[PDB]
Design an enzyme around this catalytic site. Structure first.
Site, PDB file in Angstrom:
ATOM      1  N   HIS A  22       0.853  -1.178   0.000  1.00 44.30           N
ATOM      2  CA  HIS A  22       0.000   0.000   0.000  1.00 44.30           C
ATOM      3  C   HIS A  22       0.903   1.247   0.000  1.00 44.30           C
ATOM      4  CE1 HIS A  22      -2.798   2.972   1.881  1.00 44.30           C
ATOM      5  NE2 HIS A  22      -3.767   2.277   1.299  1.00 44.30           N
ATOM      6  N   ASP A  57      -5.399  15.050  -0.908  1.00 45.82           N
ATOM      7  CA  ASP A  57      -4.351  14.169  -0.382  1.00 45.82           C
ATOM      8  C   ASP A  57      -3.044  14.928  -0.292  1.00 45.82           C
ATOM      9  OD1 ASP A  57      -3.020  11.657   0.343  1.00 45.82           O
ATOM     10  OD2 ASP A  57      -4.116  10.618  -1.213  1.00 45.82           O
ATOM     11  N   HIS A  66      -7.893  11.713   1.668  1.00 44.74           N
ATOM     12  CA  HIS A  66      -7.134  10.490   1.670  1.00 44.74           C
ATOM     13  C   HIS A  66      -5.738  10.711   2.306  1.00 44.74           C
ATOM     14  CE1 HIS A  66      -4.987   7.062  -0.374  1.00 44.74           C
ATOM     15  NE2 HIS A  66      -6.131   6.466  -0.091  1.00 44.74           N
ATOM     16  N   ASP A 113       3.287  -0.563   4.301  1.00 43.13           N
ATOM     17  CA  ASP A 113       3.187   0.895   4.222  1.00 43.13           C
ATOM     18  C   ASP A 113       4.505   1.551   4.636  1.00 43.13           C
ATOM     19  OD1 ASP A 113       0.627   1.866   3.197  1.00 43.13           O
ATOM     20  OD2 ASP A 113      -0.278   0.723   4.865  1.00 43.13           O
TER      21      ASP A 113
END
Length: 495
Positions: A162, A194, A429, A454
């Site tokens: 991700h 974002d 986001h 991540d």
């Protein structure tokens, strides 16, 4: 110390994941937030960057994000190293990558390039993306050694990459929440809001070591169709250690900015850090787990934390705050099943802070989005905070007073209108946390329970944190405060 926040986070990470220092987390000095001479806060690659305009006419953020992508890639002399969440980059993101690679080729450079996506378990996607890229590059493909792969590390834990990273020559790194998805971010009158950051220095090397960790697993698993779909240019093999093999272990200094790089290995890559002797207390009984049968990696799996230092690092960043904490996320809570609804220790750390009079702001995406929302109401956040505060303030009444005196809780807007001018709700986001106008995290790691690979940076620089306030957090609060259910600064307490 000059760096009290990083000091605290660093001591935690060394307890949690000692065996991973260097590779999945790492503290470095000598970095630079890589803004322009003209607008020095533009290291802060927000998108769209059209504050106050419900038409989003002038997208100064999006323009700068794409230009910066192209600029960094076009300055490559050895490597370009890209991770993201599937789908593979498209539209102007892809155009930015091609333009950059053509520029590097025209300057006479021969490059190695890795592009890695996390998916979701006969896949022609990677070979198809390689072929599309090679075609669009034309002659410039002749001196690029390319690796393209999709990967899933665990089907049962829904684990796959991700992270969203772009590292050039191990010297420059762009990372954050931004997926290279043109329909959500670009060709739309309701663009997702974002943020990424741009830096240079030793911390870009940390990113490169992180990607070598991921590709070392991916290359090992390349003949496993369940796990990896891999495609390469020419005769070339998989490159597990491109960064190690091609860039200096000792990345050049570029500035004076201290950083902690921190990532996670999700589930299915490595099950424990055998060097860790971390044994934390399990938090007090909660109602996070909606169904008894679910295995909960976030709240009830000690070994998971040890290969996912980013969860602890974000909880430690919260615990370091002396004055105020601003959090900007899609969500704080996850959909259950199959994840638990919330990270108990996180909410406990927010509660401990509000009990001690430290102010907390949480902005999430409008529940009207529910892809870009996982709650029905803000009350699912306030109830949980109130319940965890009750454990430490003596009851529910005191809990509510503490919460109402110390919380700002709202959904995101970027203009005076409740939704975009086209009628669609604002979607956000970000995976952003800032404390004390001092130290902040920008990365891919959500605060809601998630068991993915991540990555992100925690940066301690009051200069940069103030630019972050002026350019993102202040404008966000200016428009979003009108949706607040709790706002201590205005005496609003409706929860």
């Amino acid at each position: 110390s000059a760096t009290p926040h990083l000091d605290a986070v660093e001591q935690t990470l060394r307890q949690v994941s000692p065996g991973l220092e260097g590779d999945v987390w790492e503290r470095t000095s000598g970095n630079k937030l890589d803004g322009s001479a003209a607008d020095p806060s533009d290291w802060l690659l927000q998108t769209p960057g059209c504050w106050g305009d419900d038409k989003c006419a002038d997208r100064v953020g999006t323009k700068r994000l794409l230009a910066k992508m192209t600029e960094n890639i076009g300055n490559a002399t050895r490597t370009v190293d890209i991770s993201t969440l599937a789908p593979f980059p498209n539209g102007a993101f892809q155009d930015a990558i091609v333009a950059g690679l053509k520029e590097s080729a025209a300057k006479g450079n021969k490059l190695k390039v890795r592009i890695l996506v996390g998916a979701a378990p006969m896949n022609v996607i990677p070979s198809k993306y390689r072929d599309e890229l090679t075609a669009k590059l034309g002659k410039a493909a002749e001196n690029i050694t390319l690796n393209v792969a999709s990967m899933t590390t665990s089907k049962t834990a829904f684990s796959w990459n991700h992270s969203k990273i772009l590292v050039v020559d191990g010297q420059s790194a762009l990372t954050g929440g931004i997926n290279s998805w043109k329909d959500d971010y670009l060709d739309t009158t309701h663009p997702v809001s974002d943020v990424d950051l741009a830096l240079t220095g030793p911390a870009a090397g940390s990113a490169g070591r992180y990607l070598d960790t991921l590709w070392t697993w991916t290359c090992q698993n390349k003949s496993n169709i369940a796990s990896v779909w891999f495609a390469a240019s020419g005769n070339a093999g998989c490159m597990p250690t491109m960064h190690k093999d091609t860039n200096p272990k000792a990345s050049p200094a570029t500035g004076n900015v201290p950083v902690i790089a921190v990532g996670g290995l999700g589930v299915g890559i490595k099950d424990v850090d055998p060097k860790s002797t971390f044994r934390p207390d399990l938090p007090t009984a909660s109602d996070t787990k909606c169904v008894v049968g679910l295995h909960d990696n976030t709240n009830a799996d000690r070994d998971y934390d040890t290969v996912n230092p980013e969860e602890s690092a974000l909880r430690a960043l919260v615990a370091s705050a002396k004055g105020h904490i601003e959090i900007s996320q899609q969500d704080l809570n996850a959909t259950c099943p199959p994840l638990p609804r919330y990270d108990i220790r996180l909410y406990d750390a927010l509660a401990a802070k509000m009990a001690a009079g430290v102010k907390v702001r949480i902005v999430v995406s409008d529940p009207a989005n529910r892809g870009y929302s996982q709650i029905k109401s803000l009350s699912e956040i306030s109830d949980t905070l109130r319940n965890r505060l009750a454990n430490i303030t003596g009851g529910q009444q005191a809990a509510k007073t503490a919460m109402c005196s110390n919380l700002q809780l709202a959904t995101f807007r970027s203009s005076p209108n409740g939704k975009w001018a086209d009628g669609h709700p604002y979607a956000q986001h970000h995976k952003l946390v800032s404390v004390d106008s001092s130290t902040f995290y920008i990365g891919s790691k959500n605060l809601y329970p998630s068991w993915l690979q991540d990555f992100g940076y925690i940066v301690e620089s009051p200069e940069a944190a103030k630019q972050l306030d002026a350019k993102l957090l202040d404008p966000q609060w200016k428009y979003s405060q009108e949706t607040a259910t709790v706002d201590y600064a205005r005496g609003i307490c409706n929860a």
